[PDB]
Design an enzyme around this catalytic site. Sequence first.
Site, PDB file in Angstrom:
ATOM      1  N   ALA A 105      17.670  -1.222  76.922  1.00  0.00           N
ATOM      2  CA  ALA A 105      17.961  -1.186  78.287  1.00  0.00           C
ATOM      3  C   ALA A 105      18.211   0.177  78.956  1.00  0.00           C
ATOM      4  O   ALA A 105      17.465   0.343  79.974  1.00  0.00           O
ATOM      5  CB  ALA A 105      19.434  -1.811  78.357  1.00  0.00           C
ATOM      6  N   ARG A 165      18.863  -3.513  65.843  1.00  0.00           N
ATOM      7  CA  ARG A 165      18.126  -4.205  66.456  1.00  0.00           C
ATOM      8  C   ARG A 165      16.363  -4.245  66.020  1.00  0.00           C
ATOM      9  O   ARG A 165      15.952  -2.938  65.559  1.00  0.00           O
ATOM     10  CB  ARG A 165      18.078  -4.417  67.778  1.00  0.00           C
ATOM     11  CG  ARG A 165      17.545  -3.026  68.606  1.00  0.00           C
ATOM     12  CD  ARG A 165      17.753  -3.176  70.135  1.00  0.00           C
ATOM     13  NE  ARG A 165      19.115  -2.863  70.485  1.00  0.00           N
ATOM     14  CZ  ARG A 165      19.683  -2.383  71.484  1.00  0.00           C
ATOM     15  NH1 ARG A 165      18.985  -2.561  72.732  1.00  0.00           N
ATOM     16  NH2 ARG A 165      20.791  -2.238  71.659  1.00  0.00           N
ATOM     17  N   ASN A 167      27.338  -1.458  46.244  1.00  0.00           N
ATOM     18  CA  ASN A 167      26.786  -0.128  46.310  1.00  0.00           C
ATOM     19  C   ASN A 167      25.654  -0.082  45.782  1.00  0.00           C
ATOM     20  O   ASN A 167      24.568  -0.969  45.703  1.00  0.00           O
ATOM     21  CB  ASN A 167      27.987   0.465  45.279  1.00  0.00           C
ATOM     22  CG  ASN A 167      27.987   0.042  43.886  1.00  0.00           C
ATOM     23  OD1 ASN A 167      27.861  -1.263  43.764  1.00  0.00           O
ATOM     24  ND2 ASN A 167      28.142   0.902  43.048  1.00  0.00           N
ATOM     25  N   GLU A 176      27.533  -3.152  41.473  1.00  0.00           N
ATOM     26  CA  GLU A 176      28.929  -3.754  40.760  1.00  0.00           C
ATOM     27  C   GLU A 176      30.135  -3.831  41.691  1.00  0.00           C
ATOM     28  O   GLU A 176      31.019  -4.553  41.446  1.00  0.00           O
ATOM     29  CB  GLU A 176      29.116  -3.059  39.621  1.00  0.00           C
ATOM     30  CG  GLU A 176      29.959  -1.665  39.481  1.00  0.00           C
ATOM     31  CD  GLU A 176      29.158  -0.505  40.088  1.00  0.00           C
ATOM     32  OE1 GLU A 176      29.328   0.656  40.015  1.00  0.00           O
ATOM     33  OE2 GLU A 176      27.875  -0.756  40.358  1.00  0.00           O
ATOM     34  N   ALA A 178      25.209   4.746  32.526  1.00  0.00           N
ATOM     35  CA  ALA A 178      23.951   5.246  32.060  1.00  0.00           C
ATOM     36  C   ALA A 178      24.262   6.612  31.247  1.00  0.00           C
ATOM     37  O   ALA A 178      23.912   6.572  29.821  1.00  0.00           O
ATOM     38  CB  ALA A 178      22.990   5.744  33.117  1.00  0.00           C
ATOM     39  N   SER A 179      24.947   7.500  31.625  1.00  0.00           N
ATOM     40  CA  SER A 179      25.163   8.946  31.349  1.00  0.00           C
ATOM     41  C   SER A 179      26.306   8.808  30.417  1.00  0.00           C
ATOM     42  O   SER A 179      26.018   9.654  28.956  1.00  0.00           O
ATOM     43  CB  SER A 179      25.478   9.958  32.304  1.00  0.00           C
ATOM     44  OG  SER A 179      25.844   9.415  33.587  1.00  0.00           O
ATOM     45  N   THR A 180      27.328   8.294  30.650  1.00  0.00           N
ATOM     46  CA  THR A 180      28.708   8.331  29.503  1.00  0.00           C
ATOM     47  C   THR A 180      28.397   7.602  28.183  1.00  0.00           C
ATOM     48  O   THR A 180      28.754   7.838  27.277  1.00  0.00           O
ATOM     49  CB  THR A 180      29.848   8.099  30.232  1.00  0.00           C
ATOM     50  OG1 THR A 180      29.818   6.651  30.885  1.00  0.00           O
ATOM     51  CG2 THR A 180      30.374   8.990  31.375  1.00  0.00           C
ATOM     52  N   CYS A 220      24.676   0.321  42.858  1.00  0.00           N
ATOM     53  CA  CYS A 220      24.360  -0.239  41.368  1.00  0.00           C
ATOM     54  C   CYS A 220      24.776  -1.584  41.356  1.00  0.00           C
ATOM     55  O   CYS A 220      25.063  -2.385  40.362  1.00  0.00           O
ATOM     56  CB  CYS A 220      24.938   0.791  40.258  1.00  0.00           C
ATOM     57  SG  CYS A 220      24.298   2.172  40.214  1.00  0.00           S
TER      58      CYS A 220
HETATM   59  C1  TTP Z   1      16.485   5.510  72.233  1.00  0.00           C
HETATM   60  C2  TTP Z   1      15.805   4.761  71.151  1.00  0.00           C
HETATM   61  C3  TTP Z   1      16.534   3.803  70.237  1.00  0.00           C
HETATM   62  N1  TTP Z   1      15.868   3.007  69.505  1.00  0.00           N
HETATM   63  C4  TTP Z   1      16.951   1.996  68.641  1.00  0.00           C
HETATM   64  C5  TTP Z   1      17.936   2.454  68.068  1.00  0.00           C
HETATM   65  C6  TTP Z   1      18.864   1.409  68.153  1.00  0.00           C
HETATM   66  O1  TTP Z   1      18.884   0.433  67.404  1.00  0.00           O
HETATM   67  C7  TTP Z   1      18.445   0.622  69.528  1.00  0.00           C
HETATM   68  C8  TTP Z   1      19.304   0.735  70.918  1.00  0.00           C
HETATM   69  O2  TTP Z   1      19.366   2.207  70.980  1.00  0.00           O
HETATM   70  P1  TTP Z   1      20.471   2.670  72.056  1.00  0.00           P
HETATM   71  O3  TTP Z   1      21.003   4.064  71.781  1.00  0.00           O
HETATM   72  O4  TTP Z   1      21.708   1.906  72.046  1.00  0.00           O
HETATM   73  O5  TTP Z   1      19.829   2.465  73.671  1.00  0.00           O
HETATM   74  P2  TTP Z   1      20.635   2.126  75.050  1.00  0.00           P
HETATM   75  O6  TTP Z   1      22.143   2.070  74.976  1.00  0.00           O
HETATM   76  O7  TTP Z   1      19.972   3.038  76.077  1.00  0.00           O
HETATM   77  O8  TTP Z   1      20.041   0.744  75.086  1.00  0.00           O
HETATM   78  P3  TTP Z   1      20.815  -0.796  75.147  1.00  0.00           P
HETATM   79  O9  TTP Z   1      21.653  -0.681  76.282  1.00  0.00           O
HETATM   80  O10 TTP Z   1      19.795  -1.817  75.046  1.00  0.00           O
HETATM   81  O11 TTP Z   1      21.747  -0.519  73.837  1.00  0.00           O
HETATM   82  O12 TTP Z   1      17.108   1.093  69.674  1.00  0.00           O
HETATM   83  C9  TTP Z   1      14.804   3.250  68.993  1.00  0.00           C
HETATM   84  O13 TTP Z   1      14.252   2.861  68.001  1.00  0.00           O
HETATM   85  N2  TTP Z   1      13.946   4.379  69.590  1.00  0.00           N
HETATM   86  C10 TTP Z   1      14.516   5.037  70.550  1.00  0.00           C
HETATM   87  O14 TTP Z   1      13.886   6.104  71.084  1.00  0.00           O
HETATM   88 MG    MG Z   2      23.245   1.103  73.115  1.00  0.00          MG
END
Ligand code: TTP
Ligand code: MG
Lengths: 738, 714
Positions: free
Chosen positions: B250, B243, B399, B403, B577-579, B401
């Site tokens: 949440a 995300r 990957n 390919e 590259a190497s081979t 490179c």
């Molecule tokens: C905890 C945390 C998550 N993240 C990012 C990593 C994940 O891509 C994304 C979700 O983390 P999750 O570990 O899924 O957090 P959550 O399950 O408590 O929240 P949700 O119900 O919304 O899924 O947020 C951070 O960038 N910093 C943080 O400190």
């Molecule tokens: Mg989560």
Amino acid sequence: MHVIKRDGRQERVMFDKITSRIQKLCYGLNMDFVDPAQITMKVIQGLYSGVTTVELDTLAAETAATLTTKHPDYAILAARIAVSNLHKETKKVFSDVMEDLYNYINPHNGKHSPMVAKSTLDIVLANKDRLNSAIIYDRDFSYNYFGFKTLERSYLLKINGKVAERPQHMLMRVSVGIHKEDIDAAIETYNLLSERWFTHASPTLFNAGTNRPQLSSCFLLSMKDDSIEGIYDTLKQCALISKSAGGIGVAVSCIRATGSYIAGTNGNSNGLVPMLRVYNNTARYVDQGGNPGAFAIYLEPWHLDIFEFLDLKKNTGKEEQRARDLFFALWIPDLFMKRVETNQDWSLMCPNECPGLDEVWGEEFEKLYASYEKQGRVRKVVKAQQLWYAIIESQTETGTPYMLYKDSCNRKSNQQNLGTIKCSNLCTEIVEYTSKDEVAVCNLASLALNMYVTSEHTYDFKKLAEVTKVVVRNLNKIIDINYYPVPEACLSNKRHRPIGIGVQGLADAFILMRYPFESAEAQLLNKQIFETIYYGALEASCDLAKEQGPYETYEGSPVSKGILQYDMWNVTPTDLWDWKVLKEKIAKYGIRNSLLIAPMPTASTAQILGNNESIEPYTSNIYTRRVGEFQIVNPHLLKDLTERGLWHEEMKNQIIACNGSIQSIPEIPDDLKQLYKTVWEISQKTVLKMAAERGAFIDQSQSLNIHIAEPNYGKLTSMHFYGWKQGLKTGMYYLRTR
Amino acid sequence: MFDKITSRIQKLCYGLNMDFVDPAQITMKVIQGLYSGVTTVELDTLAAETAATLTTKHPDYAILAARIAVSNLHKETKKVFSDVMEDLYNYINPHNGKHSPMVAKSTLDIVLANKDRLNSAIIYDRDFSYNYFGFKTLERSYLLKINGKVAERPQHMLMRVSVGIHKEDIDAAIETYNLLSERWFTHASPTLFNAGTNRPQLSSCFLLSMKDDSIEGIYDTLKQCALISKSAGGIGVAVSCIRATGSYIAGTNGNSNGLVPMLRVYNNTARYVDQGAFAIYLEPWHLDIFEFLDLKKRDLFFALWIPDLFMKRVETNQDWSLMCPNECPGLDEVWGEEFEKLYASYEKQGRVRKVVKAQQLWYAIIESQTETGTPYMLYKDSCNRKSNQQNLGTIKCSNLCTEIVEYTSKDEVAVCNLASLALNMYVTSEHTYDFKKLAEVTKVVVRNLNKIIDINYYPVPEACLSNKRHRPIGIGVQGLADAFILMRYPFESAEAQLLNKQIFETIYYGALEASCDLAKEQGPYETYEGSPVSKGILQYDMWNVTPTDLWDWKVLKEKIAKYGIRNSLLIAPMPTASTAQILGNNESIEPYTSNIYTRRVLSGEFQIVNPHLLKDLTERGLWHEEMKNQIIACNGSIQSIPEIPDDLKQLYKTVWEISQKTVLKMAAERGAFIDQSQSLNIHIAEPNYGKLTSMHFYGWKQGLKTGMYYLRTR
Ligand SMILES: Cc1cn([C@H]2C[C@H](O)[C@@H](COP(=O)(O)OP(=O)(O)OP(=O)(O)O)O2)c(=O)[nH]c1=O
Ligand SMILES: [Mg+2]
Ligand SMILES: Cc1cn([C@H]2C[C@H](O)[C@@H](COP(=O)(O)OP(=O)(O)OP(=O)(O)O)O2)c(=O)[nH]c1=O
Ligand SMILES: [Mg+2]
């Protein structure tokens, strides 16, 4: 000029009515110095018509709080005004707010996002009447401005950016969150919390009675093994803990030094530094989102990468050789300290060449280490003092690393029977066992030590024991309610059930008793207070063992052998408590908890109660609190000066001109001067000695900051070695200078 | 004196061009390295080094240099293979005293039980078949060393690999030893390092899909990458499900930090476990796309996994919707019309975090490429539409490179198993092309790579699962530029364009034929039924191409229809590259980028001219020092040299002088017979944004899976 009242109606701004409202909130305040009309005067000055009463109130509260430097009761009055406003902006019934919090729907998501747990709401609704009427809202007025503002910013649950919880609502939430159907126990805890006898730690205050409750939020981990798999398994753990806002102490000494052979890949190890960079950046990344997680890294000084470790926090450096978001700590064997002072050689080792050095303490360590030296299994030898200088150079630059004495920690742990303890926590007060299967947890609260002094300058030891017993019971219930971020943490807490009861307002309790920090009276009160805390705690723990059985790993521990903490320090307690009678109860039933006492930093919660932090002297008699910045005089000293008729504008100026010292002000009597010495004027050796004396009754450790105004190598050396020789487990948390 | 040194050099000049190789020229430099107490072995390196500096006079000097260095090696190594394998096994590390075998016990036991046949099958004169620079590459990384002293001859190494692969099958071991020692093909570097040893990680590449969008998932995948990176393999990672910056968390009531600080943890992991190169694949609908197009502007490599919809929106000057995968789930699990319908559905549903001009994103991509050469350009819908693995679900990345196009999921990390055919070997003395022999060797390579799948040390269980379910392989090439030159064909000529089709028709045909034979002996791969080839659709059908009349595809389709195939994927021209440096060929499918280039060998630098060119120029009495310096002044070009015949100018155009659309079109044409993709660099000397834009769009419209690996600008 007109104010806009809450009902939207226009009212004439009147000196008498504004003064009048302030007057009604002055019950119990020193009216010889607190003048309601003084506030009204400054408020009406910068005041334009179109202002709302909520704005007016805010202004009046902020004005009252700048007058704290005239008398400390002004700060209380400022909170009284703020709370008065908060009550007008809040619902009055507890169960009502709990419903509003539960029924919350996020506006830009549309999703039902309860702010309290359903099972808490259910208990609350089943017991509406008793719970709602047990609450005393006049207790909201017991805070000072700066305590209230701390609560308001973080601790009162907000509905759409608006505070919905009164302080009393939060406290009852916590209480029900801990005790659920035991409404008797919930009300006992609510009364104790709201009357300010003790407080639960921030984690508990935040999340008690919420979903997946994070009630304990400090942890300790040992590196699994010396492999990419082990290193990255632990990293995931730390990431997961950090997501739950957990602080962490991590032991890292089992990891190969730089240049060490890797038999698998036919290459050589990068050592600790590059690995710690991964942990550093994990701390920055998993910071709960948008704001950095806090990891304290523990290293034993025999490790070959010690010198580079000692540099990771330097602000001058090379970026790729820096990890400035981590915190650093040494886990020190006695052998090192003995080689330093005798000026001998010290051998630096790779744990892969010399395995098991971290799994072994004391004589067993010295024996294993000496044979590795004799077998020539050593990578580099330096003079022990050279490493010593690197340590003290690091502390002069950064205030760290923290100083922990591994043998002291292990020799005097009731968790001794589990195996060697490899590290402490973020804050250096917790000494708990860790392994592959076990991440240790810190379950924490603090007693407000100022509350137990009576109007007759006596210390209420019985009350302190009785409150401590409730705290033990509460923290013991928290162990079972807590939602654990990793299962190794759950395993550890359920097996050994440690807890950590600490303190705040030690300095306040000395001052209220009229004792200088360094006096014979304070040194004896210090022992007595901590004897009492240890005594009541063991007694509660014993009672819970009678009711529920001891913790799993009780059989084999020192206490099961009739050995208590002071036995391990070879100290004989004072005659205050009958320890022979307690021992006989423990022999009967055992104890519920492997560990009990651990004086933590009380940064946030001491501010809420208005007490000086922890076991610490007032660092200054005049200091600032940021909210704008506010000037604060030591509230005990300001009362003394105003009662005597000594306080004036230039008198405040001269104390600021003296770096918060009152020693050279000739109008202050000498008995006041010795009462209000700053930490910078108090002997640090005396601080160390007082910590060792209370230490005999602390089965964990204590976060001990040391304050040396103008340090050099001689000052830092003699204080560290003094602390070590006292038997301290934590010789130093932070080093503070100026 | 001068005579004894000259004669000693002369003894190794057999077969060399004596018009241009002059042993006295070497002697002059050796003579002045004399002193009381000088050993002939010390004078021998001086002679090999001097001879190698003289490579810029004629390429046979590099052969003479190799012959000298190899004579020293032969005198400083044991001559019997089973003896060398024994010393490698019995190795006792003197730092700890612990027995630390450098070959596996099972390999040694096979060798000892069969030492008569194995020791005697080896032809040590084949050690002299590498030039100086190719041998020095071998000597530094490929030949096992005991206490800083080479124990393995190149023949020993090649026989170790052969028994490493074939084990108790001695007939197959020797057949492979012969093909490798005669240089008809080579196995990938990891196979050459690791075969017959204790940790036989023989695979080059790994690809992974980001598990869950959570801390748990991000850090599980990270652990995967650290474990893979432990085994030196490269990595492609799909990241689009994570995300975007500012998205609600949440469980913590906070806001996600997005891709950048997550990528810094991976960056650090790549730096930390070397004994590391991760390519990060992002789909351009992701809200963090602009901040992604800036990270390299660091131990990570960046790539776009591009839908057709983005390309359509760009050329039609339309708006593009940026989305967070948490608000808009499943965009990466779906391709083609299914993606376009889902994407538009989220657009109409209003769930779009930002809307930009598609052109704005487009130019941000161009600017990033002109500054760094990256991101790589992959066409997600072409990759998916024309994949034999498409019955498994959507393919989420390529990957390191570019390919490899293989499926990944929670349960499967893809790996590939690689080798390359030396295309220069198959041109005949009569300037014709031996397709029959190319097919033959290809059949052997398929069987070698299938064996590798079963004996491989896998760093994670998910990689093992993936490889055993689908059995993909990647057979590539090297020296394509050399094959054209040996046939006297300019790269862009109609003769080159046709041979290009024919070569790849041949590789695909032989590969499918061997894979089909294996399916008959051992049954098809687990996941075969449902695949496009089980329905009688081969790769070229997917491009709407009808092969030339060279090979009988009707008969082959009949065989596949009856038995099926052992491997889900077969062909993937990788960079080599190497081979390629070992075998003295130009890498992969690419033209000579310059006619003069330098190679470093430790503390020595050497100027090297295109060996074909240097032969053509010396033979015409055109080569001299001001000539060399003129070509160096022209960035390795010969187009502006008046004394050079136009014939030769046409043949030795550099990649900068060759039309890049022609390169793209030739990639497209061989691509119809390429199972996976191909590592395709674009070379634009004076790059305006319009020129680059029209190259991406031309390659896209040609149906290319990889539109661009690296952009080179100078
Ligand atoms: C905890 C945390 C998550 N993240 C990012 C990593 C994940 O891509 C994304 C979700 O983390 P999750 O570990 O899924 O957090 P959550 O399950 O408590 O929240 P949700 O119900 O919304 O899924 O947020 C951070 O960038 N910093 C943080 O400190
Ligand atoms: Mg989560
Ligand atoms: C693979 C690797 C390991 N290490 C470090 C991390 C570990 O502390 C240590 C061992 O890593 P391991 O993953 O245990 O390496 P290994 O098992 O192949 O080698 P051995 O059997 O000798 O243990 O080496 C690096 O520093 N860089 C690397 O690339
Ligand atoms: Mg290992």
